[PDB]
Design a protein around this ligand. Sequence first.
Ligand SMILES: Nc1ncnc2c1ncn2[C@@H]1O[C@H](COP(=O)(O)OP(=O)(O)NP(=O)(O)O)[C@@H](O)[C@H]1O
Ligand SMILES: Nc1ncnc2c1ncn2[C@@H]1O[C@H](COP(=O)(O)OP(=O)(O)NP(=O)(O)O)[C@@H](O)[C@H]1O
Ligand code: NA
Ligand code: NA
Ligand code: NA
Ligand code: NA
Lengths: 578, 578
Amino acid sequence: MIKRYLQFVKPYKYRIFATIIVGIIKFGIPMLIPLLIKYAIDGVINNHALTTDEKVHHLTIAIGIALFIFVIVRPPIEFIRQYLAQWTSNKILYDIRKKLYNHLQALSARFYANNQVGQVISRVINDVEQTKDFILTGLMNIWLDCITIIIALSIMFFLDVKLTLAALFIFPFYILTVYVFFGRLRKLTRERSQALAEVQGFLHERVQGISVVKSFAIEDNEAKNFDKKNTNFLTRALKHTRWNAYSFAAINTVTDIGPIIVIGVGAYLAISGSITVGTLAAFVGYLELLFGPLRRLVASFTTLTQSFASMDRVFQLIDEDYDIKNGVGAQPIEIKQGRIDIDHVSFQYNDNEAPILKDINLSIEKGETVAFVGMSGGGKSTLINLIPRFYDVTSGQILIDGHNIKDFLTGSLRNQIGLVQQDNILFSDTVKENILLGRPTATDEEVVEAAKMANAHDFIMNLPQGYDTEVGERGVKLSGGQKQRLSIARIFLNNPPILILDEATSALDLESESIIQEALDVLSKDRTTLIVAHRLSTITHADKIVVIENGHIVETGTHRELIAKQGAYEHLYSIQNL
Amino acid sequence: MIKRYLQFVKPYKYRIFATIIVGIIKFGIPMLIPLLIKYAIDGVINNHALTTDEKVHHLTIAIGIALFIFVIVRPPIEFIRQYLAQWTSNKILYDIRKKLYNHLQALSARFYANNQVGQVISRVINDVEQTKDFILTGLMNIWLDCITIIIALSIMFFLDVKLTLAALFIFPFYILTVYVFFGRLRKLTRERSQALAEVQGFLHERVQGISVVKSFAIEDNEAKNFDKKNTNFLTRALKHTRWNAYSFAAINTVTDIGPIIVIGVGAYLAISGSITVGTLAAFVGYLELLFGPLRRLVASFTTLTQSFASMDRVFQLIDEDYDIKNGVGAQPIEIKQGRIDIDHVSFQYNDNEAPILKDINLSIEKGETVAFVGMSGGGKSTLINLIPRFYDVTSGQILIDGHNIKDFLTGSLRNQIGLVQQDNILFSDTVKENILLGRPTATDEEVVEAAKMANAHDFIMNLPQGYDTEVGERGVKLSGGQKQRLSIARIFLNNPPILILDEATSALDLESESIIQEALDVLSKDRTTLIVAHRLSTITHADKIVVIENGHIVETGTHRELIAKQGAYEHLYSIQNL
Ligand SMILES: Nc1ncnc2c1ncn2[C@@H]1O[C@H](COP(=O)(O)OP(=O)(O)NP(=O)(O)O)[C@@H](O)[C@H]1O
Ligand SMILES: Nc1ncnc2c1ncn2[C@@H]1O[C@H](COP(=O)(O)OP(=O)(O)NP(=O)(O)O)[C@@H](O)[C@H]1O
Ligand code: NA
Ligand code: NA
Ligand code: NA
Ligand code: NA
């Protein structure tokens, strides 16, 4: 997995090597201080053979050299060292989210139907952000502490063989201890982040649906439901904390026996006649070089563990399967004549549940306007959404111009089906911006046309700041008949070969309906049109009305014919002016 | 402002003092190492009064002791020190969000109409989380570095009053430099977080409205709109980084002239007779005690700056005004007879724009069923939402049972108005759980009743896992007529004195409508009922139909009467069969 994450760092290897290099060229600085203390003390006074005008000169080039270094050389090193480190990782994260976002937009209706936005976003943002330390503490700092440990161990290896061995005794345990905790922390961190992710999802879901929370003044009740999630997140976060604290003491206690099992031995050796009591003095002086980094790595360890947990979660999302895949046979196909064929189609949202659409057979020739009518929850919506291929039929096939939907390139297919869903969306943008969704690359002139078409242009002008009026988030600042008509506009703008209208009238008064009806009757003159509808009267003109019951097509025909049959269709119609 | 944030820490003062105490009792440990060293060397090896059996002996008591301390005393100190620190702040954050959530649920439709969920949540979560360092690095660590600076400084002053002035010379500049940057960083951090907040809002808004992004295969276009926001966030984050790096080098360069200017003067003073080498050398071993903490504080500084920026943003949200306030006169009032009076009401969403409802006068007696009909965007929705007081009328008054709506306690008022909005909400929960929103404290039996009432009970049983079926996020796994009927259920469950139904039929077929119509005609027998509707026929039975045009009430009357007048009402009705 590290290899994966590394794939992100790849185009930044050099900036990172550089960051490490400049990193090493830093220890050289702290050592210049104690080096300078020795120069004035033993090179101007303890020389005893210098003038009181000569030594008061060398102290003006030594107090001249130091200043130069520290006031000119160090500053740039310090700066670059940091700026680099950051500039690097920060750009890396950028890259990761650029990818995640494309990933999301490529998941299927299903995914988003069984997932919580808040939770998803937690990952894309927080978990990713968390992998930052892996780049910094992991690939840019840990090394310097190991280099320091090599140097130290090395120097010690010369001063004395067995004495350094007195040290290394600790090492194995240290490593064992790390290994013991690592895993459990990784999980605790995982479980923690997940908790956070759940409060996010909660907030998201509620903050957006407050309308309801307000209407029934259930603030107190929901405020509880929140505390549950907010608490769960504490709890988990504490478990995590407890262990980090725990493991920290552990690893260190081990790292601390280090200098002891050394000093103790270093004496029982200098006195037992094994080595110079000067060697013991020097050696023990380097103890800070060995068990210093080991102490830092304990913290570096911790941080990483958490980081791993995070990249886990990131990748886990990245590894989500796309339910609607293009497949090798991909083929941007132009739909020249709206010929739709539904052969033996059968649909199921899941393998466990029952099928919603069972055996559906229906043929729609170019230019026909087919209407779909039936009790609520019959299948209409489901059936329809199978065409733009939002879900893949379970058993059977749908063919546009003889081509099986699956053999189209997603975008191609979808781009040629103007679809007005029943639950229509608006972004917290301007009117224009919203219509432009139907065709982003459109003339401010063409938009105003679509508008006038969907019977929108007019009310758009009365809006403060007209076509540039910013509608509310979710498009709240408009009526029902308004939001809807903007969705309809999008259709004219798209001006596709196939038009599917799932109750595209829902919120319009009788009049406005009349207008859009006319408008549509025109645009729907020579295009393959599918209409789901409950208000029958706006379907009479249909070339063929399809009655759908309990996932089946029960009746088929012209309003005239269906009415004669005095069957299912008639029943429903008959309920209007009766 | 610090005082504010501190108010959160208050109930944790002791745990914090404790964390600081145990914090101090830590430096005592690192010093035990060099003491065991000096004690071994200058104490047992060179005592010149030790039997080879005594020095070894006294050596051992020094080790047996060391192990005890480090393997028994230190561990607990280490643990507690951390666990405390964390347990504290983590609980503090918890508290802060507990408050923020209540804050949100108390903001008005307006707030949420001009704000972006994602952005809000960024604050509640990220910005708050960011204030964590203020507790840790601020109130628990900074001190220890100052204590260390006092201790250090004291020793210098008794060692030479005029050389400590060679050291302290730096101090003022150090402080000046900090002051110079602080502010700019605080902003950069602010601006950065805001950027993050904007990508959040983007993600939220899109990830939830992908349905549309998919339908028009505008993935490429939106993926761009994302990169803009994702980039903006980089940029800003880099600006921030650059400065931190910058300021870091700065402050340190200053902190580095420190040990030098002590040597620059101190050495010159040894010469002229200030004092000798025995002092210049001793006043230099402690240099690490002074310019060590000063170096750490540079980092502590940085971290804080960021923290402040964060609490700024948190508070800024906390300081948001509630548009609908209760006011001293608050009074949980029981509405015994649904008497609604709309006297000269006039509404405007903003002071700049034009009024939507102008001069409306209408009286509704208990048990009357008033219908509201008119072109789309006329005012109906707006008018209606004024009653549950979702927005305060601009000029005029609405009175229920003679009591002015404003004199009710929000919850009281709203709890007594069963409101079925046109754009109905569902949470990613189970069917039951959703209906329970109408009355959380309800009998699994009463729910099933509401259900059967809204004509839902039936389809709920055919659902895999019946009343326990988990509907999709936003309630996606149900038809239109389905989601809606669940909203209607909520009403029966609430069983309020006043019922407002804003197109509560929108997505139902003719039949299902018939059923709920009957169901309602019953529940609406003796209650004050207000109905907004476009499908006229389901309004005929109204006691009084109100025609609303361009924010005005144009016609008033019984379907019978209105039809005779051959005016505005008739026109609209007349378009049904025509
Ligand atoms: N949050 C808002 N800010 C500004 N204007 C708003 C806001 N919310 C709604 N509006 C106004 O909504 C207005 C009229 O709404 P309105 O006529 O009450 O909806 P309606 O006719 O009942 N909806 P419908 O029954 O679907 O046709 C427009 O002229 C908008 O400016
Ligand atoms: N994500 C899902 N998982 C399982 N079932 C689903 C899901 N989404 C929708 N359904 C099914 O929705 C079904 C029938 O939907 P359907 O009849 O197409 O809506 P419809 O009749 O067109 N809506 P409407 O025009 O408002 O009456 C139910 O029996 C559900 O089980
Ligand atoms: Na047609
Ligand atoms: Na009534
Ligand atoms: Na409305
Ligand atoms: Na539907």
